[PDB]
Design a protein around this ligand. Structure first.
Ligand code: VWB
Lengths: 551, 406
């Protein structure tokens, strides 16, 4: 328990002083329990009794289950102590763990109480044990070690543990020690004999620095239930995922459901959550019951089918290559596997998009490659080679013409449909022999009524009326009109920067029904050229359609 | 030596910026670099009681890895120190010179102790793979490369070292920006290059070790070009009328009344329409209005510079620098021969624009980059060679302004 470790210095935040929080009374059955606990902790150096000079006090409580435990409320002191370098906010991912012959799990007991607490900072931990009915002054006590529930303890313990391990690691440079809260995980490829030896020797090193470690009879055994995972000597998978069945669905219930599914998706290939999360767009209230859509019902039912099957992932070998394969898995949903030898997956994942109202497949595929490249560096420190269902000509045509800069990595074509394809492609030059439609639309911003019209060079003209619309949507409806009323080749001329931008981006899927209709039309056309002219400049064709639609 | 005290602008806490994850190769290079730096006293390990962090990266300027620290946040929080209390002035004549060489003098900062009460704000982390270990944590004991306080403090010594040389060569301009020396002359190139080697030898023999030719007499706002064609179709006149309409936001004296008349009526897009003589004269007069430059565009040192970049295809990129829209201080076009990709090209262009910007005004612009953020955050170090880092954001709107700036 006690320890010759050096102490980390601690300050309160500048211009603050220590906490003086008055102590609430106790049932005096617990007041007896605290006295026994405090006298034990005193005898082990964990705390010391203090005089009246100490003005600070932090509330102390007591609580039972079999046995009792002391609980201190450091919330006031925590608010007042300096900041620390936050301890690791992530955990290692099993798909990144390197395979190892033998692995041992050591928990360290009373870990915090084993590490000393900076001397000048001890006064601000003072607590007080109450005397029955204020019949006498209480007992003053302060901490000498890292108190449980204080802000500094997780970081000071961790840095302490690192330094303590350092000499042992220098002398045994071929055994791996992951460190994670009050745990150590030790692996080696030594003969299970010598491995069991080296472990016992490291236990002894830790005990010299005051860290109790479990006996061979008490060291946990595989499979390991760790952070929602199940680790096996040669494979890993998640812990069982139980999706509730319910007739009414609360917002809080939907959040808990997307989370559970998200967790399953890292090894259960195929999971989808796009429609389920669309529901959650109403973050308004957590109890407000959201009526499940019919797309959401289909999604959930498909997830339940896959969850019924069991599945597992493997561990990482740095000598074998790293490969990522991606498949189209719905409308705007994508799924991927990462592996080193086929069917022996390290892990899986998904990619849906909230990028904007309209996108297309090639852009989404590129966005997915990006997400994987980020993930692989975090997990293995390198990028995979990619196996993708798209041909070089499809992708090269897209990235050369795309206004944004993209980096496409090492990849190869895989002939497993659905393939990623450009459904249509606008012309670059006007079309000879094709009718030229001059379109325009308009709306009254108050009355919210409007009209879409065209005028062509063969003398045809048309106006179609529009109710409950906006100026932007009518400029799109004019475009849609011209595709409807044209032959298989058409030139269109628009005044609308909005509408030009949206079509020049060659979307193939949209949140808007109108854009989805235009997309249906653009596919069936042999050739479409779209051209822009500035509005209200009397160009020729725009002026007429404007006069026709505007008044 | 003695250490000059430093202070953040009051009511500011030090930087707490997240460390990006790194390739194992980049981490291995950082560990080896920091092991040696620690063996030489320049940095030391730190404990959990330091909550500060500033991101670090590994690049190549050469086949040897180098360490680059992103002090943008710490710079924004010390700016009393290096902008006013210890500003290093910018000379307006550097842009006029005919040759300008950049010399890296950052290594000389490592000979000067840093204020013991400021070192904690320089903390940084070498990350581990897959959160296996918490990173390795260090702070600086000497003046760091990349912190704008470093040239500010070293300024006195730099003036002493250079004073001989400026006496000998009074027509040579020397400007310092962060870790670099910009040295400009009107000499012939061969004479200029040996004058630069003299200054190298001078700096070296006084203990300041050092390891790029620019010609700011070519830089200018590029004037707009209208197409010159033999057979104009209706579509061609519409593009031309549209481009000229756009240009009237800048040059007040342009009109297309005579040019739109040739489209009167509702005509097919592919119809060849000949240019009448009054139309041809209106277009030719507009080509003269475009040659002359704009008036009324003055640099305002208080305001932020902004750079916009658009991808033109075939390895070509256009850019504008301005502080108010349509008031372009500088417009230009970059090209990349053959063995290149989009991110490599954008990264290179960003560095050329930032250099031009430093020469002309002594400050770096804030970029609007046409690229997805996570793609940039992943690949920008693969081609980054400079020692400074401008601010940036990612613009997801592709205006038709592409065709116009071509
Ligand atoms: N409860 C818990 C817990 C246990 C061990 C962990 C663990 O083991 C290792 C400890 C040291 C070195 C390598 C290690 O992984 C090797 C991969 C391998 O072959 N395994 C079979 C079962 C465990 C993993 C690593 C990370 C977290 C662990 C968390």
């Amino acid at each position: 328990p006690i320890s010759p470790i050096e102490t980390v210095p601690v300050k309160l935040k500048p211009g603050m002083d220590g906490p003086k929080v008055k102590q609430w009374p106790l049932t005096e059955e617990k007041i007896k329990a605290l006295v026994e606990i405090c006298t034990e902790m005193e005898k082990e150096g964990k705390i010391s009794k203090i005089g009246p000079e100490n003005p600070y006090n932090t509330p102390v409580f007591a609580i039972k289950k079999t046995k009792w435990r002391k609980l201190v409320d450091f919330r006031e002191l925590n608010k007042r102590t300096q900041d620390f370098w936050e301890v690791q906010l992530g955990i290692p991912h099993p798909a990144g763990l390197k395979k190892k012959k033998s692995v041992t799990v050591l928990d360290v007991g009373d870990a915090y109480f084993s590490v000393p607490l900076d001397e000048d900072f001890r006064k601000y931990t003072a607590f007080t044990i109450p005397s029955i009915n204020n019949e006498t002054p209480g007992i003053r006590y302060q901490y000498n070690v890292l108190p449980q529930g204080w802000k500094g303890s997780p970081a000071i313990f961790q840095s302490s543990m690192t330094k303590i391990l350092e000499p042992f690691a220098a002398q045994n440079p071929d055994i791996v020690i992951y460190q994670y809260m009050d745990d150590l995980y030790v692996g080696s490829d030594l003969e299970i004999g010598q491995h069991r030896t080296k472990i016992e020797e490291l236990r002894q090193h830790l005990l010299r620095w005051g860290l109790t470690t479990p006996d061979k009879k008490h060291q946990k055994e595989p499979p390991f239930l760790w952070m929602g995972y199940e680790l096996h000597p040669d494979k890993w998978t998640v812990q069982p995922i139980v999706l509730p069945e319910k007739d009414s669905w609360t917002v809080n219930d939907i959040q808990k459901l997307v989370g559970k599914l998200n967790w399953a998706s890292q090894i259960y290939p195929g999971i989808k959550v796009r429609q389920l999360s669309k529901l959650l767009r109403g973050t308004k209230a957590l109890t407000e019951v959201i009526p499940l859509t019919e797309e959401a019902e289909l999604e959930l039912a498909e997830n339940r089918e896959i969850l019924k099957e069991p599945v597992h992932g493997v561990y990482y070998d740095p000598s074998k290559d790293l490969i990522a394969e991606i498949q189209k898995q719905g409308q705007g949903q994508w799924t991927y596997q990462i592996y080193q030898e086929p069917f022996k997956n390290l892990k899986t994942g998904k990619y849906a998009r909230m990028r904007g109202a309209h996108t297309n497949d090639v852009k989404q595929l590129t966005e997915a490659v990006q997400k994987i490249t980020t993930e692989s560096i975090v997990i293995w420190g390198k990028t995979p080679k990619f196996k993708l269902p798209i041909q070089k000509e499809t992708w090269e045509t897209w990235w050369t013409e795309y206004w944004q800069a993209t980096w496409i990595p090492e990849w190869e074509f895989v002939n497993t449909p659905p393939l990623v394809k450009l459904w249509y492609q606008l012309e670059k030059e006007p079309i000879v022999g094709a009718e030229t439609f001059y379109v325009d639309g308009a709306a009254n911003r108050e009355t919210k009524l409007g009209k879409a019209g065209y005028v062509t060079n063969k003398g045809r003209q048309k106006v179609v009326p529009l109710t409950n619309t906006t100026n932007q949507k009518t400029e799109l409806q004019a475009i849609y009109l011209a595709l409807q009323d044209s032959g298989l080749e058409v030139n269109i001329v628009t005044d609308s920067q909005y509408a030009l931008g949206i079509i020049q981006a060659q979307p193939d899927k949209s949140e808007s029904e109108l854009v989805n209709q235009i997309i249906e039309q653009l596919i069936k056309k042999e050739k479409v050229y779209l051209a822009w002219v500035p509005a209200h400049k009397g160009i020729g064709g725009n002026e007429q359609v404007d006069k026709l639609v505007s008044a | 030596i003695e250490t000059v005290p430093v202070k953040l602008k009051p009511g500011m806490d030090g930087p707490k910026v997240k460390q990006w994850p790194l390739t194992e190769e980049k981490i291995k290079a950082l560990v080896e670099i920091c092991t040696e730096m620690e063996k030489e006293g320049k940095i030391s390990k730190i404990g959990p009681e330091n909550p500060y962090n500033t991101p670090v990266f590994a690049i190549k300027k050469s086949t040897k890895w180098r360490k680059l620290v992103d002090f943008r946040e710490l710079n924004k929080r010390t700016q009393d120190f290096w902008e006013v209390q210890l500003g290093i002035p910018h000379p307006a004549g550097l842009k006029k010179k005919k040759s300008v060489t950049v010399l890296d003098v950052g290594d000389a900062y490592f000979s000067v102790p840093l204020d013991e009460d400021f070192r904690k704000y320089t903390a940084f982390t070498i990350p581990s793979i897959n959160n296996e270990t918490p990173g390795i944590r260090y702070q600086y004991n000497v003046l760091p490369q990349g912190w704008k306080g470093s040239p500010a403090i070293f300024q006195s010594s730099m003036t002493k070292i250079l004073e001989p040389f400026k006496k000998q060569n009074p027509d040579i301009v020397i400007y310092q920006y962060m870790d670099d020396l910009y040295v400009g002359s009107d000499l012939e190139i061969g004479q200029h290059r040996t004058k630069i080697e003299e200054l190298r030898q001078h700096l070296l023999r006084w203990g300041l070790t050092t390891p790029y030719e620019l010609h700011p007499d070519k830089w200018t706002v590029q004037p707009i070009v209208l197409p010159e064609k033999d057979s104009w179709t209706v579509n061609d006149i519409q593009k031309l009328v549209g481009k000229l309409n756009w240009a009237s936001q800048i040059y007040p004296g342009i009109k297309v009344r005579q040019l739109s008349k040739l489209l009167r009526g509702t005509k097919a897009l592919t119809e060849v329409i000949p240019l009448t003589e009054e139309a041809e004269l209106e277009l030719a007069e507009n080509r003269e209005i475009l040659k002359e430059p704009v008036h009324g565009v003055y640099y305002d040192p208080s305001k932020d510079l902004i750079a916009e970049i658009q991808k033109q295809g075939q390895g070509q990129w256009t850019y504008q620098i301005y502080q108010e829209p349509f008031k372009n201080l500088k417009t230009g076009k970059y090209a990349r021969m053959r063995h290149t990709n989009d991110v490599k090209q954008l990264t290179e262009a960003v560095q050329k624009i930032t250099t031009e910007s430093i020469v002309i005004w002594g400050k770096t612009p804030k970029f609007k980059l046409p690229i997805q953020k996570e793609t940039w955050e992943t690949w920008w170090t693969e081609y980054w060679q400079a020692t400074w880092i401008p601010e940036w954001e990612f613009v997801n709107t592709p205006p038709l302004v592409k065709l116009w700036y071509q």
